[PDB]
């Protein structure tokens, strides 16, 4: 009587949104960027290899200084490497050896990690006692934490496998603003440069944009045909790129509320695990699971180059804040710095 | 050597960290990692109670014959399995527990599919998974006595219509074991070790130790180029 009416109303709204998006597609990003000189071949070499892990590396995150990066591996260790000297600054033992995320705080005082234990553990790097202590174990998620990101030293956003994203108060240790709306498992979230909005790519083939103080989903982005595994904002903050299991990267723009262009190749039939943008936003480095990472031009579908040198699936890669290096962490226990 | 004193001390600290990491890796490499993947509640707790101890994921630590073990009751995840099942790639074996009493019961959530058929489907899904091609499976068929009394009082044709054997416990158990083992499409790179356990059984740990030693010996022989 009413459930069918509600479903019909939802379908009519969905068609209305689809009609509205089409009216805004006067041109395409590929058509506009036709008269632009291609970036050409990008020959990035493995400058410095970071060895010492003994298991599969599932996540890494650079620091603000663009010199220190953290690495999370299945062996229960969290090494803070010094990329300039290939030095292990810290080795953090973990109570849970199953980790899927690790985040470096902008100030460098704290690092986070999480995984199948369903707890985000915040570790205090610089203190007295000369050790790294578990500052806070954030609990409340009912699923594995796929990705966590620091807003500041006290607020952290976490995505988990309960189809829910959460915003935490580290000092209080209590979930502050739950983010509901996803249908499948949330696999990755990225924070905007202004730390105001964040987009989470879930296993429902959709990426949703959220507002921090409001908890509402401003707008949802669809177009993928498989599970979204990676996500990353444009440096501007008005667009983001998603990585899925269908060998496809899609650049969604927030203001037009639709997809700009698709980075797909017929040769590639694997999935995509990690996606990041360069400092200028022209190159989209996507970490595929066919032992390779592909450097995609953001404005043109052409592939600039391929980052080869990993003997297993590439699981995590991110560009430094100054854009001077790319560090790809793969399933084989090695991190490679590329420039 | 074109390095400052603090740089040299940082290199020394990195070397000490690497030494500690190597020690931890040597300690962990001598431990056996097992993944517990029982279907629902098909006697998944009786086995861990029998093995003793010496939140989404549960780790059970027990030592037998000076060998450390690592069981991971990951059934309390309630998420999409294939998004985290590759974390367990490289475990020595998978301990799959199936209750033989489920051949009469029907899943409450569905009320249509037999519980043992659901267990068979889960076994098929996990045995042929790409991440677990070379990982042996230790099959546990619990509820031996309750299945005994059922098969004495009730027939097995409810769960397996294409059954020709008698109602004796031995033939029924053999049929269930061969039906479960037939689901293994990797007859060459995998082995299934099957044991029938009850509530009072105490040789389950010894059976698991034998199976894990067999798996490790086969892996070592393959690694050393002898197979």
């Amino acid at each position, epitope marked *: 009587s009413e459930l069918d009416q509600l479903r019909q109303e939802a379908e009519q709204l969905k068609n209305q949104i689809r009609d509205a998006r089409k009216a805004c597609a006067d041109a395409t990003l590929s058509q506009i960027t036709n008269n632009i000189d291609p970036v050409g071949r990008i020959q990035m070499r493995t400058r410095r290899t970071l060895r010492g892990h003994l298991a599969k590396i599932y996540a890494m995150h650079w620091g603000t200084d663009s010199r220190l990066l953290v690495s999370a591996s299945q062996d229960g260790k969290l090494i803070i490497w010094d990329s300039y000297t290939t030095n292990k600054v810290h080795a953090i033992p973990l109570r849970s050896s199953w980790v899927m995320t690790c985040a470096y705080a902008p100030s460098g005082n704290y690092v986070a990690c999480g995984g199948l234990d369903n707890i985000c553990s915040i570790y205090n790097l610089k203190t007295r*006692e*000369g050790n790294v202590r578990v500052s806070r174990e954030l609990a409340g998620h009912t699923g594995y934490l796929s990705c966590c990101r620091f807003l500041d030293d006290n607020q952290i956003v976490t995505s988990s496998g309960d189809t829910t994203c959460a915003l935490w108060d580290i000092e209080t240790g209590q979930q502050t603003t739950t983010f509901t709306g996803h249908t499948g498992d949330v696999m990755s979230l990225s924070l905007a440069p202004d730390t105001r909005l964040f987009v989470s790519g879930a296993c429902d083939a959709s990426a949703k944009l959220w507002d921090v103080r409001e908890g509402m989903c401003r707008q949802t982005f669809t177009g993928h045909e498989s599970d979204i595994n990676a996500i990353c904002f444009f440096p501007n903050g008005n667009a983001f790129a998603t990585g899925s299991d269908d060998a496809t990267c899609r650049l969604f723009d927030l203001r037009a509320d639709q997809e700009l262009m698709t980075y797909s190749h017929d040769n590639i039939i694997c999935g995509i695990t990690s996606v990041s943008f360069s400092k200028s936003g022209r190159l989209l480095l996507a970490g595929y699971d066919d032992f390779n990472c592909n450097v995609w031009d953001a404005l043109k579908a052409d592939r600039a180059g391929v980052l080869a040198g990993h003997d297993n699936r590439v699981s995590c890669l991110g560009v430094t804040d100054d854009g001077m290096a790319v560090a790809t962490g793969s399933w084989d226990s090695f991190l490679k710095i590329w420039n | 050597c074109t390095l*400052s004193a603090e740089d040299k*001390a940082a290199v*020394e600290r990195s070397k000490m960290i690497d030494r500690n990491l190597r020690e931890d890796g040597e300690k962990a490499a001598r431990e056996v990692k097992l993944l517990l993947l029982g279907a629902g509640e098909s006697g998944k707790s009786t086995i861990v109670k029998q093995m003793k101890i010496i939140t989404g994921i549960v780790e059970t630590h027990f030592t037998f014959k000076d060998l450390h073990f690592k069981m991971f009751d990951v059934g309390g995840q309630r998420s999409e399995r294939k998004k985290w099942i590759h974390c367990f790639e490289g475990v020595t074996a998978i301990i799959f527990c199936v209750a033989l009493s489920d051949y009469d019961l029907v899943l409450a959530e569905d009320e249509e599919m037999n519980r043992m058929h659901e267990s068979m489907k889960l076994f098929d899904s996990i045995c042929n998974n790409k991440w677990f091609t070379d990982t042996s499976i230790i099959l546990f068929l619990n509820k031996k006595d309750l299945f005994e009394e059922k098969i004495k009082k009730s027939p097995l044709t409810i769960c397996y219509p294409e059954y020709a054997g008698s109602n004796t416990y031995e033939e029924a158990a053999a049929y269930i074991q061969c039906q479960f083992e037939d689901l293994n499409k990797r007859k060459d790179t995998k082995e299934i070790y099957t044991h029938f356990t009850c509530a009072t059984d105490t040789k389950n740990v010894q059976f698991v130790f034998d199976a894990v030693t067999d798996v490790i010996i086969k892996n070592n022989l393959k690694d050393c180029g002898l197979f």
Partner: single-chain antibody
Amino acid sequence: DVQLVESGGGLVQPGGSRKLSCSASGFAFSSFGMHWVRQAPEKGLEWVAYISSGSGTIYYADTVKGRFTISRDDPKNTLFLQMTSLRSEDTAMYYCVRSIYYYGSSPFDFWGQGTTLTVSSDIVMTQATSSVPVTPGESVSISCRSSKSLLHSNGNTYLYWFLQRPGQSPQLLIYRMSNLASGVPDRFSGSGSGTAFTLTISRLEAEDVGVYYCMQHLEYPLTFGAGTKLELK
């Protein structure tokens, strides 16, 4: 809290042998490299010895090389300095110094309390200002010079600023310059040009008086300049 209680000093006849023990509590002694710093009854600070984590690298001053030995016991959380054939030049206050070395670390961040002992090619660090009078609320500028440039090829210039209040152990103010120690206020600031270095305090209080020591960590042995005494008017 973090503390370093050191004892084992007293009246020693010349030519004797007495060892110093430094008990470490409230921090991970194993991961910290420990130093011994001397202080004559009326003279400046002088580096003595240093033992790293795991005793991998051990360094001595030229005046104590082959004569003193330094060792640590990590399980007992203690530091040792066995001194042999003590002379009249060793009568001083010996300080237990805590140091760590990673990227962004703060070496020499914590000091002991002193051990009263009495006996019956190197970079030269200079501070011209022996005494400086000042009133509270003003601004000072303590100047220290080096005989060799302390700006290494890696961009890190190795100079450390310490403050010794009357009757208290030295406290780290500013490690490799333009870096503020964890705990000291924002009044202190340091700058330099490879050879000439300065420390500036914006506003002075009654607790900022004392003697300021500049130290170099570019290469062993570590050298302390003669301190600049700050006295109220």
